[PDB]
Amino acid sequence: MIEKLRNIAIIAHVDHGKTTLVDKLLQQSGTILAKNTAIKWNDYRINIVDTPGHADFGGEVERVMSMVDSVLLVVDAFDGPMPQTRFVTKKAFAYGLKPIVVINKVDRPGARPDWVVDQVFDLFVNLDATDEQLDFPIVYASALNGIAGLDHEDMAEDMTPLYQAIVDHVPAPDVDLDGPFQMQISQLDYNSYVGVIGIGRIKRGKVKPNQQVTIIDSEGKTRNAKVGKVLGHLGLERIETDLAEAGDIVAITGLGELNISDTVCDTQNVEALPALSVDEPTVSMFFCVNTSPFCGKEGKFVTSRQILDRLNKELVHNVALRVEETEDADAFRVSGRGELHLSVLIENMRREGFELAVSRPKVIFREIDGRKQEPYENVTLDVEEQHQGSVMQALGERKGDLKNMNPDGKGRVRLDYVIPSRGLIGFRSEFMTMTSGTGLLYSTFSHYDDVRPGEVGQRQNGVLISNGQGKAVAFALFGLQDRGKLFLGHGAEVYEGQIIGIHSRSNDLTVNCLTVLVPPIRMTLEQALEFIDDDELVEVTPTSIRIRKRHLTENDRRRAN
Ligand SMILES: Nc1nc2c(ncn2[C@@H]2O[C@H](COP(=O)(O)OP(=O)(O)O)[C@@H](O)[C@H]2O)c(=O)[nH]1
Ligand SMILES: [Mg+2]
């Protein structure tokens, strides 16, 4: 009784048809997407909660997973599952959800249902439980036709098989209807007429308008309020309801400025629901002021405790990152998920008009049970077979453990590896030019395990360091090619300590370029950032980043050796 409820989330890569699919389920029932679509189908109430784009480090995904009891993975019948929906799927498994895989667009010519089944199944290499991987039902669809079926040759005349699968395989909400009222805010919304809107799935009890209630946050603070309106979902809309009970995904009004993870409880029996997720950062990196003599050249405006507050602004757009204070009052220890995470932060921190010095990314070590541990992660690589012998030995040098390989049959091959983040850092740069830029690479954090004894091979080559400040002349640069490749041509402005090229030998060579050329080496942010040794820093400015030593003079460098 009152358990005909099906709270399910939906995951789909762009243009894989999740808007069309949900739309068909709506029009064929008794009732861009909406955040939640309520569907009445034969006295069943199915809530389809939407998942955000592949780039949402705010932590909305895990909030969504906290409201649903299953997830709906929509996959193109030809393209198969995309690595963009990787993490959203990962978090679904992390919340112990058993997925329902919908392979739609089955009507397109060359659709390979059998193949995309394997791909999805293999994609569940997300340390996914047997329970999750075994018996995930496969509903084939053609959303643009409104047709579904358990087989793709044998298809129903409507979306009935999909409805049935949802009813059959999605568990009812694990809630008690008779307990005292309890509801955690999962998402927020606003209406200039209604005010702040709190959205979530009622964990316990019931709620009516004008009900007296107590709000308790994650730390333990409490405040009393009276709910104004209880908005239930019906279609793509929200209507005022006189009663909402456990299991219902509803919207509440007039509780003031609700914060996410606040728990709305009956005035007595105030019980805060546990704060849910946190993506522990695995890669640390230093953000420093531009100590360089080019302090305010192109960099619009930055002092010490200026960009610091910007490192207190990105702190809620993402909780996978941390920001700590270093002894150097002009440098800060900011950590994150991967290197790509901290990378793009800079990329339009640059377009934001900033200038900063940044070290090389290092993995965050953790000591557990006396044994130090480092982050390992799963890597899938898609290269041409002319590169497979090359990229294999490369990862092997980076302490990569081979787990699986699968030839394309058409000249390519997909490789799978278990590798510590330590050895994977800055490999994307080497990888691309190694595979001539046709190869592809994807990564996903797996687990912390005992550190692999040893270190990753260092840069081997030394660097050409400028001894003074001035304009680089063609007469000197031509003589420098006798000892390696350089980073600029005639006319470029350089200072002392700045690295201008790559030494042919292993040692650092202090050279002057002040007293026609071969094409200079231009490095992108990530390409350069993978070139950096522990005694160096990248200097980033809104038009182009440059490279330098930590200690600018040759006198200071000798002391630190
Ligand atoms: N041929 C074909 N096209 C489809 C099917 N389902 C959806 N589409 C098309 O895919 C395009 C984008 O799908 P959409 O619903 O927006 O998916 P979303 O972008 O992930 O929300 C639309 O133009 C649809 O016409 C299908 O079963 N067959
Ligand atoms: Mg669209």
- Reduced to 3 states (helix: H, G, I; strand: E, B; else coil), residue 442 is strand
Q: 143 vs 27, 102, 105, 159, 317, CA distance in Å?
A: 12, 10, 7, 8, 34
In this structure, the number of other CB atoms found within 10 A of the CB of residue 540 comes to 23
Specify whether 21 is located in the same domain as 133. yes
Distance of CA 357 to the CA centre of its chain: 24
* Mode of pairing for the β-strands spanning 509-511 and 463-466: parallel
Specify whether 48 is located in the same domain as 72. yes
Q: Is 107 annotated as a binding residue?
A: yes
Closest to 261 in 3D by CA, of 217, 322, 210, 229 = 217
Under DSSP, the state recorded for 303 is -
CA dist., res. 434 & res. 438, Å (int): 9
Distance of CA 515 to the CA centre of its chain: 49
Ligand 2 centre from 74 Cα, in Å?
14
Q: Taking the CA atoms of the chain, what radius of gyration do you get in angstroms?
A: 28
| Ligand closest to CA 14 | 1
Q: How many domains, in total, are found in the chain?
A: 5
Residue 196 · residue 257 · CB < 8 Å = yes
Atom index in ligand 1 nearest the CA of residue 141 equals 27
* Mode of pairing for the β-strands spanning 98-104 and 138-142: parallel
Specify whether 20 is located in the same domain as 126. yes
CA dist., res. 428 & res. 457, Å (int): 15
| Structure tokens, 103 | 């392979």
Specify whether 251 is located in the same domain as 284. no
Atom index in ligand 1 nearest the CA of residue 15 equals 19
CA dist., res. 19 & res. 13, Å (int): 11
In this structure, the number of other CB atoms found within 10 A of the CB of residue 287 comes to 25
Specify whether 92 is located in the same domain as 111. yes
Give the residue from 420, 455, 490 where a domain finishes.
Answer: 455
549 burial (CB, 10 Å; 0-12 / 13-18 / 19+) is buried
Give yes or no for residue 14 CB within 6 A of ligand 1: yes
| Ligand closest to CA 17 | 1
Q: 1 vs 5, 177, 204, 368, CA distance in Å?
A: 10, 11, 16, 47
Look up the CATH number of the domain holding residue 296: 3.30.70.870
Give yes or no for residue 34 CB within 6 A of ligand 1: no
Specify whether 337 is located in the same domain as 325. yes
Specify whether 179 is located in the same domain as 169. no
Give yes or no for residue 142 CB within 6 A of ligand 1: yes
Give yes or no for residue 17 CB within 6 A of ligand 1: yes
Q: Is 105 annotated as a binding residue?
A: yes
Look up the CATH number of the domain holding residue 373: 3.30.70.240
Atom index in ligand 1 nearest the CA of residue 20 equals 15
Specify whether 247 is located in the same domain as 101. no
Residue nearest to atom 25 of ligand 1 (CA): 144
Give the residue from 314, 342, 364 where a domain finishes.
Answer: 364
Specify whether 322 is located in the same domain as 409. no
Find all residues with CB under 8 Å of 248, minimum gap 6, and list them.
5, 201, 202, 232
CA dist., res. 156 & res. 144, Å (int): 14
List of E strands, 35-163: 36-41, 44-50, 70-76, 98-104, 138-142, 147-149
Q: What are phi and psi of 552, to 5 degrees?
A: -75, -30
Atom index in ligand 1 nearest the CA of residue 12 equals 20
What are the beta bridge partners of residue 128? Answer: none
Closest to 103 in 3D by CA, of 117, 85, 90 = 117
Residue 481: how many CA atoms within 13 Å on its side-chain side? 13
What are the beta bridge partners of residue 373? Answer: 366, 450
Where in the sequence is the domain holding 303, given as residue range(s)? 276-364
Structure obtained using: X-ray
Look up the CATH number of the domain holding residue 22: 3.40.50.300
Give yes or no for residue 15 CB within 6 A of ligand 1: yes
Residue 512 · residue 476 · CB < 8 Å = yes
Closest to 21 in 3D by CA, of 159, 173, 222 = 159
Specify whether 1 is located in the same domain as 88. yes
| Structure tokens, 27 | 């029009």
Give yes or no for residue 16 CB within 6 A of ligand 1: yes
Ligand 2 centre from 32 Cα, in Å?
6
Residue nearest to atom 2 of ligand 1 (CA): 105
Specify whether 164 is located in the same domain as 45. yes
Closest to 238 in 3D by CA, of 259, 224, 252 = 252
Specify whether 179 is located in the same domain as 168. no
| Ligand closest to CA 142 | 1
143's enclosing H/E stretch is: none
For the four alpha carbons of 40, 42, 44 and 50, in that order, the dihedral sign comes to negative
Give the residue from 139, 174, 209 where a domain finishes.
Answer: 174
Q: Is 490 annotated as a binding residue?
A: no
Look up the CATH number of the domain holding residue 194: 2.40.30.10
Residue nearest to atom 19 of ligand 1 (CA): 15
Give yes or no for residue 421 CB within 6 A of ligand 1: no
| Structure tokens, 339 | 């290197």
What are the residue ranges of helices labelled H in 316-424? 339-347, 388-397, 421-424
